[PDB]
């Protein structure tokens, strides 16, 4: 006969049930291959068609085997990925790189997988942790040495983390989260370029800048901040700017007074480096 698969959307548990439907002694079987997290020890399992496992959000190759001879067909299950709006505290530094992510139950084995975006393909990195419990803050952690290029290059990385209490059982993996991160010294690299100040009215100016390099990496750029300094009163003002906007209007300026403007780009966890200061007057 002919069989077609169905899949649920990823649930809060990081699972989704692969179901089956028939639309055309004989034996029918299923071979299941988990593609994501390649550094895991066990990657395939042969199952009965009737038991419908709860997969993770990883990518899978599923193929139907029939025994009597038989026939074999395969469908590549796409990796549906949840988006965590809160960015993870990923710190790239002089001595190495460190991650923190929300942990769940105790004695959990985690697989961290990342690959640089838009060299679409390439350096696919995979990491498997020893079983570990949540810290008092409810977080798990792992670290790499400086030599380990773990997000050490100033590029956008796509990260996916999986969890299992029994990593040797293929059908027990769950998705934790997926996220984007810009590696290296993102605070310095994220500095906006081509900052310009233009006369908008007799008492207002338009400030424009090129989009930060962080804006190309989804969810990384939290906001822009524009700092304006009155060089006579020494008064300073900061204006947060939506990450989708690269322009802001400053009003209430006084004639003859010199002003200074700087722009920075902030992530959820890092203050950006200020741009070169702009000197101007009405």
């Amino acid at each position, epitope marked *: 006969p002919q069989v077609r698969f169905s899949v649920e959307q990823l649930g809060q548990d990081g*699972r989704r049930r692969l179901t089956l439907k028939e639309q055309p002694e004989v*034996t029918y*079987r299923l071979q299941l291959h988990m593609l994501s997290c390649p550094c895991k020890a*066990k990657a395939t*399992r*042969t*199952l*009965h068609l*009737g*038991k*419908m*496992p*709860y997969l993770s959000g990883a990518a899978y190759n599923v193929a139907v085997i029939s*025994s009597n001879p038989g026939l074999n067909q395969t469908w590549h299950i796409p990796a549906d990925t949840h988006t965590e709006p809160v960015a993870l505290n990923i710190s790239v530094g002089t001595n190495g790189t460190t991650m923190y992510w929300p942990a769940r*139950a105790q004695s959990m084995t985690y697989c961290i997988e990342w690959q640089p975006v838009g060299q679409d393909g390439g350096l696919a990195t995979c990491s498997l942790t020893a079983p570990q419990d949540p810290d008092p803050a409810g977080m798990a952690t792992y670290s790499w040495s400086r030599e380990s290029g773990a997000m050490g290059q100033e590029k956008c990385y796509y990260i996916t983390i999986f969890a299992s*209490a*029994h990593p*040797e*059982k293929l*059908t*027990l993996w769950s998705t934790v989260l997926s996220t984007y991160h810009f590696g290296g010294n993102a605070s310095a690299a994220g500095t906006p370029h081509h900052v310009s100040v233009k006369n908008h009215s007799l008492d207002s100016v338009s400030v424009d800048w090129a989009p930060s390099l962080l804006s190309t990496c989804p969810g990384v750029l939290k906001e822009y901040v524009v700092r304006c300094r009155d060089e006579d009163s020494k008064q300073v003002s900061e204006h947060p700017v939506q990450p989708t906007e690269t322009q802001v209007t400053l009003s209430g300026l006084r004639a003859g007074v010199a002003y200074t403007v700087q722009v920075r780009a902030d992530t959820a966890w890092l203050r950006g480096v200020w741009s070169q200061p702009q000197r101007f007057s009405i």
Partner: antibody, heavy 120, light 107 residues
Framework: VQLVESGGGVVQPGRSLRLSCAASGFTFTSYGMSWVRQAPGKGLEWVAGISYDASDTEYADSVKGRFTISRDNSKNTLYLQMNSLRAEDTAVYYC??????????????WGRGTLVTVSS | IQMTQSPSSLSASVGDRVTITCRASQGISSDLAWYQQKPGKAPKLLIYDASSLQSGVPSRFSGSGSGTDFTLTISSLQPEDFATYYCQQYWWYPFTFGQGTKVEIKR
């Protein structure tokens, strides 16, 4: 992790008896459960199983129409309703845990077991 | 699915290398488990997925095989290993056990 069976004893043939298993030490709602019985001088026989959300239930052929497995996830209790009991059902009944959502793989935790004697 | 173990019983001494076989009436790939039971006690899971060792089990235990023929192996028999051993398929419902193999002490 502990599993405690209760409700066993003597029961006349054709009558009914309800077994209960109390679970503790883990998240009861996240694991499938099963019952396994063992006649005194005999080997092991899998009786019934149920998934984590009680959506999947399976029974052995020798008990299909006669037994009923169920779970109360709010009270961490597994149940086995036995009706129309025969003498062959006389066995020690264990409750055991499955490591996944679905009824799958081996049984990593077992209870003490309770004796059920079916006789008049 | 019928699960046939061989032999039904065997006698061995401490230190011996023990091998039990398990045979399935139908092909079950790797969905097989092994259990150990002592008189008057609940069974204990030793090996799953035909060859994965369960946590806490000593390294002297090992399993292998696929399809219809499976083997359980104890490299060096220890005094606490004398018991009865059962294989079980979970390839499909209803789950079925083998008849058991009793490992006794030879004298």
């Amino acid at each position: 992790v502990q599993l405690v069976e209760s409700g066993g004893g003597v029961v006349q043939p054709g009558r009914s008896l309800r077994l209960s298993c109390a679970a503790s030490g883990f998240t009861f709602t996240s694991y499938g459960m099963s019952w396994v019985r063992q006649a005194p001088g005999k080997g092991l026989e899998w009786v019934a199983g149920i998934s984590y959300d009680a959506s999947d239930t399976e029974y052995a052929d020798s008990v299909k129409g006669r037994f009923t497995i169920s779970r109360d996830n709010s009270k961490n209790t597994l149940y086995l309703q036995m009706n129309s009991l025969r003498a062959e059902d006389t066995a020690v009944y264990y409750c055991a845990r499955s490591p996944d959502y679905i009824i799958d793989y081996g049984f990593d935790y077992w209870g003490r077991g309770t004796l059920v004697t079916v006789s008049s | 699915i019928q699960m046939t173990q061989s032999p039904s019983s065997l006698s061995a001494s401490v230190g011996d290398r023990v091998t039990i076989t398990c045979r399935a009436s139908q092909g079950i790939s790797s969905d097989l488990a092994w259990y150990q039971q002592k008189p008057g006690k609940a069974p204990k899971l030793l090996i799953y997925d035909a060859s994965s060792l369960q946590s806490g089990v000593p390294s002297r235990f090992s399993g292998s095989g696929s399809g219809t023929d499976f083997t359980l192996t104890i490299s060096s028999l220890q005094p606490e290993d004398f018991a009865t051993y059962y294989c079980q398929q979970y390839w499909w419902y209803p789950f079925t056990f083998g008849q058991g193999t009793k490992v006794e002490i030879k004298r």
